[PDB]
Design a protein around this nucleic acid. Structure first.
Ligand SMILES: [Mg+2]
Ligand SMILES: [Mg+2]
Ligand SMILES: [Mg+2]
Ligand SMILES: [Mg+2]
Ligand SMILES: [Mg+2]
Ligand SMILES: [Mg+2]
Ligand SMILES: [Mg+2]
Ligand SMILES: [Mg+2]
Ligand SMILES: [Mg+2]
Ligand SMILES: [Mg+2]
Ligand SMILES: [Mg+2]
Ligand SMILES: [Mg+2]
Ligand SMILES: [Mg+2]
Ligand SMILES: [Mg+2]
Ligand SMILES: [Mg+2]
Ligand SMILES: [Mg+2]
Lengths: 19, 62, 51, 216, 124, 128, 225
RNA sequence: ACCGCCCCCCGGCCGGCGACCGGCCGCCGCCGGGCGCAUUUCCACCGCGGCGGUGCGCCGCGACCGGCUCCGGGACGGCU
RNA sequence: CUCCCCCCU
RNA sequence: CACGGCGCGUCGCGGCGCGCGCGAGCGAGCGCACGGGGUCGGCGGCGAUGUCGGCUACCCACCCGACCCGUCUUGAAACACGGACCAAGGAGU
RNA sequence: CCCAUACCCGGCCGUCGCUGGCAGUCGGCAGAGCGAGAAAGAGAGUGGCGCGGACGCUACGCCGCGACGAGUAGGAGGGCCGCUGCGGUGAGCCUUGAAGCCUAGGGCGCGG
């Protein structure tokens, strides 16, 4: 997740899930 | 006390043309700006060669 | 930037290493619990000796 | 809207909470608290109406001006500084004033004031000092105490009351407040034998006695 | 051009005075009276000046026009403003800003005008 | 109620005594003006203990408060009225001094003009 | 227009904030894992010694891989060879210190300069305190104090060192890139030893301070920093 | 006679007129005079009035915050 | 920006 | 416990790991602070012919330090040489 | 326990290095960023009221970070240090008092 390139979609996933 | 030598501490390269004419200095201003605000090294080389002396800028023949 | 001592500045230490907070919280709670346990054990031992 | 609840964790140590992030996520019940997405005035004039512009431009700029300052966080005005008090000082304790006009006079202490100064008084009937303020640093707190937990001092007296004005004339309010306080203080100190004379006396240092040796 | 004559005159002007570890410029249309490329009043095509009025009260604002660069006689236009300080400053500010006329001198012109005005007010 | 500068910082000087030339006390022919000794045996040159100090660059005052008068201003010398208007915009930091050659007849005019223009003059009553 | 541009600004802002949050969580979990690993390593030696004693044999612990070296002599009158070795070890000033990984070359190099240095085997607490209090990074040939994790992350990102915890762990365990980490680490400038030294000139074994002291270097560090 | 270059006239393009513009129109700003006539605008004074900036005539004290240090008092734990 | 309960003024 | 949505869930080993959609990577406010170098929205006195300030500079006292310069020289305070004092002139053109 | 001009922390001066940064003062004709671990576009497009906003920039200038600073013989640089005369320039100064000289007066500069 912390990787800027490959973790973009996972970051989007957790961000949307927090909502 | 530090175990160092200060012989070669100061580098000798030119920072600006030794000449006093104004046209070359205007060119130097322009290319200073270009070199420091452009990533291309052609500008850096050109500015460095502008700094140089006459004997270090030999004429180029046709 | 003025360099503050992480070993003495809690939030500077947290900025550099967030897990230090959980470490310090855990050790404070553990020490308090251990001290309470030892105090109560000493009180019980004194009561038994009096008995 | 919503009544402001108190903090869910007691302060374990300054800056560290008792409960961790997950314990807080549980206690706040955030698992069910999810959320998702002037300068002109018109006036009549007797013409027509005029749009007057308040906050008008200045009629003089100075020759030069200083720049702004950088921002800092830990600095607070004296009004909201946290007030500290020595452990040895409790209401009903005898203090020794060290620097005022009342040098070395034994004085009873009543209350810590709002700005940190000590509201102090030894009944001026015997040691001749009124209701007064004194800095906690410039007094020696001896280990002799009386019980004044059952006395009432007026709430109207405060730092605004004791603030200097502007010849100084004592006011009838000052007199009546001093009488009200001393009428309760005096019987308490008269119960303890040889205490009124002790308060009347004045502390001093003679040869052969040293503060670091003597205890008080 | 402009930078060329600036390089010519940066150190060899009759308006230059240098003493006490200082340096000052003297030519008329020079706000802040200091030797600099921005504020030199003879180099640039667009120049702003603020002077006290010939009469004991008022402020003269001088603007360099665009056409007659080589014609000194008909190169400056002068307007005299004799009103309250607030409206004088507002007029100068509008002239500098809404004309897009050398905007970097707006605050300098306002400061200089304010000063001239105070000077004009009787002393205590 | 003289005019005050824009800012009055705390001027700090690393040294206040003058730098006295070595052996200038023994002789009158030796002026007080500093000269670096260059003798092969000179104690002052060799920096012996308890001798006359030698000026270094380390004593240099800080740039923020360098050349500041005790009143907080910086000096500027003027010879006539026309040079006074130069200091119109360097008002709150630069004070004016009348040159000693100026006659009193012009001195009164210069001081009165400076009074109008709110420029401080350090010697306003120099001829009375 | 820019009805989309304005929202794109804050979209980028939110993306960057989420990335920063993820990085913080990563370094927090890595610190927790490092703490677990340290506890495991500490208990393992105790366990092995106990089992060896129970069996009646002996358990010789592994030779230490990391040492701390402090220069304890001045600049005046140094043999050229000793001067060269001190330059290589980066001790150009009295009461300078540095970490050295151990092998045959390091042993012989330190033996050459025994009279000029006091060196030992640093403790985990000593490493922690030295990194946090005196630790400066050598960024762009400039001595920069390490006040933020990004300074470490740029200079050692390619080696997967991204914060103080990575730097300390890598130094203490002598990782694969210990050379890069130590070289990025500027030599430590330690204060004079509070309480004084025993005798600077002679060896530690004969009551002095020079030479190798196995674990007393921690006692020395406690007062020199 | 031919070729090269340059000056001038005419015709056609390209570019500039910011080291070098005139007229017309539009927009804006400024100034002078009337219109405006006082809940607008301006000038001067008072309050120990407030906010912001800079400072105090001299001599002093206190408070909290941060950096660096020296020291003291507690309590907890590991190999032992 | 959910809802309850307890205590002191 | 730096755990927290629903799903399609093999993106899967047997669920956990771990992928694809969910107007599609936008929730907002207030508040406290061990948080990119000090502020007080805190105070107290003394001021007209005897008092306030004046680093340095004038004189004096005290404590510590302190041998006379220039020069040749391995080595100068030297029982090595030049020098009573002052003014002007005086030597890489 | 005592203290060196040594070491650690802080302030200030200067030197050296980064051959560092700034022409972006891009304003009702505008939209105020390029400090942020990851070589590169706040990319352009086509289909399913109140008129308002400090300083700057002698670019031979201004600003920011680090490190360092002994010195004879000797070498180099900068002197808004000094003396005399010449070409320019200061609508400079001056019998309402120039030069020079004296001073327990007020100051500036590390120093000349
Ligand atoms: Mg040094
Ligand atoms: Mg060299
Ligand atoms: Mg010698
Ligand atoms: Mg030795
Ligand atoms: Mg000690
Ligand atoms: Mg020896
Ligand atoms: Mg002596
Ligand atoms: Mg000789
Ligand atoms: Mg010799
Ligand atoms: Mg002889
Ligand atoms: Mg001889
Ligand atoms: Mg003789
Ligand atoms: Mg002579
Ligand atoms: Mg330092
Ligand atoms: Mg040197
Ligand atoms: Mg004399």
């Amino acid at each position: 997740i912390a990787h800027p390139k490959l973790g973009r979609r996972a970051r989007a996933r957790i961000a949307r899930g927090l909502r | 006390g530090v175990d160092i030598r200060h012989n070669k501490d100061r580098k000798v390269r030119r920072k600006e043309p030794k000449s006093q004419d104004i046209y070359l200095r205007l060119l130097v201003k322009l290319y200073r700006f270009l070199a420091r605000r452009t990533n291309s090294t052609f500008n850096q080389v050109v500015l460095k060669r502008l700094f140089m002396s006459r004997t270090n800028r030999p004429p180029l023949s046709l | 930037v003025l360099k503050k001592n992480p070993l003495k500045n809690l939030r500077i230490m947290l900025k550099l290493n967030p897990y230090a907070k959980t470490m310090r919280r855990n050790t404070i709670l553990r020490q308090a619990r251990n001290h309470k346990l030892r105090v109560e054990r000493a009180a019980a031992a004194l009561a038994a000796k009096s008995d | 809207k919503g009544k402001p609840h108190c903090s869910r964790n007691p302060v374990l140590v300054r800056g560290i909470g008792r409960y961790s992030r997950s314990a807080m996520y549980s206690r706040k019940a955030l698992y069910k608290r999810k959320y998702a997405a002037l300068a002109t005035v018109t006036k009549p004039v007797g013409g027509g109406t005029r749009v007057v512009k308040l906050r008008k431009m200045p009629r003089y700029y100075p020759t030069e001006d200083v720049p702004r300052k950088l921002l800092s966080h830990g600095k607070k005005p004296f009004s909201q500084h946290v007030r500290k008090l020595r452990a040895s000082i409790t209401p009903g304790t005898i203090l020794i004033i060290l620097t005022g006009r009342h040098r070395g006079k034994r004085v009873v202490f009543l209350k810590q004031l709002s700005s940190g100064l000590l509201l102090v008084t030894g009944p001026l009937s015997l040691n001749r000092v009124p209701l007064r303020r004194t800095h906690q640093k410039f007094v020696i707190a001896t280990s002799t105490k009386i019980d004044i937990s059952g006395v009432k001092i007026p709430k109207h007296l405060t730092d605004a009351y004791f603030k200097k004005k502007k010849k100084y004339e004592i006011t009838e309010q000052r007199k009546v407040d001093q009488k009200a306080v001393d009428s309760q203080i005096l019987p308490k100190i008269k119960a303890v034998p040889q205490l009124q004379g002790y308060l009347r006396s004045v502390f001093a240092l003679t040869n052969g006695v040293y503060p670091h040796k003597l205890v008080f | 051009s402009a930078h060329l004559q600036w390089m010519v005159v940066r150190n060899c002007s009759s308006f230059l005075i240098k003493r006490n570890k200082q340096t000052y410029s003297t030519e008329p249309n020079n706000l802040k009276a200091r030797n600099s490329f921005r504020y030199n009043g003879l180099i640039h095509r667009k120049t702003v000046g603020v002077e006290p009025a010939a009469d004991g009260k008022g402020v003269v604002v001088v603007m360099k026009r665009r056409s007659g660069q080589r014609k000194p006689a008909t190169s400056y236009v002068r307007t005299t403003i004799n009103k309250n300080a607030r409206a004088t400053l507002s007029s100068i500010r509008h002239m500098i800003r809404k004309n897009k006329y050398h905007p970097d001198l707006r605050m300098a012109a306002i400061r200089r005008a304010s000063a001239i005005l105070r000077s004009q007010k009787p002393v205590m | 109620a003289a005019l005050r500068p824009l800012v009055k910082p705390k001027i700090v000087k690393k040294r206040t005594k003058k730098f006295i030339r070595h052996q200038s006390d023994r002789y009158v022919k030796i002026k007080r003006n500093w000269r670096k000794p260059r003798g092969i045996d000179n104690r002052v040159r060799r920096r012996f203990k308890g001798q006359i100090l030698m000026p270094n660059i380390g004593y240099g005052s800080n740039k923020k408060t360098k050349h500041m008068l005790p009143s907080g201003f910086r000096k500027f010398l003027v010879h006539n009225v026309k040079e006074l208007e130069v200091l119109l915009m360097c008002n709150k930091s630069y004070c004016a001094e009348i040159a000693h050659n100026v006659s009193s007849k012009n001195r009164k005019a210069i001081v009165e003009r400076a009074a109008q223009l709110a420029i401080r003059v350090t010697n306003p009553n120099a001829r009375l | 227009n820019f009805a989309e541009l304005k929202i794109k600004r804050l979209r980028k802002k939110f993306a960057q904030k989420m990335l920063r949050k993820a990085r913080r969580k990563l370094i927090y979990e890595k610190a927790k894992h490092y703490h677990k690993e340290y506890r495991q390593m500490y208990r393992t030696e105790i366990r092995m010694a106990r089992m060896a004693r129970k069996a009646g044999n002996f358990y010789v612990p592994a030779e230490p891989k990391l040492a701390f070296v402090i220069r304890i002599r001045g600049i005046n009158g140094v043999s050229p060879k000793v001067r060269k070795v001190l330059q290589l070890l980066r001790l150009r000033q009295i009461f300078n210190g540095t970490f050295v990984k151990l092998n045959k070359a390091s042993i012989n190099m330190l033996r050459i300069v025994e009279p000029y240095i006091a060196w030992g085997y640093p403790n985990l607490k000593s490493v922690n305190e030295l990194i946090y209090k005196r630790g400066y990074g050598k960024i762009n040939k400039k001595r920069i104090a390490l006040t933020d994790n990004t300074l470490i992350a740029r200079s050692l990102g390619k080696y997967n060192i991204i914060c103080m915890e990575d730097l300390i762990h890598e130094i203490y365990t002598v990782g694969k890139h210990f050379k890069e980490a130590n070289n990025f680490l500027w030599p430590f400038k330690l204060s004079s030893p509070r309480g004084g030294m025993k005798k600077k000139t002679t060896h530690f074994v004969e009551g002095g301070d020079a030479g190798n002291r196995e674990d007393q270097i921690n006692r020395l560090i406690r007062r020199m920093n």
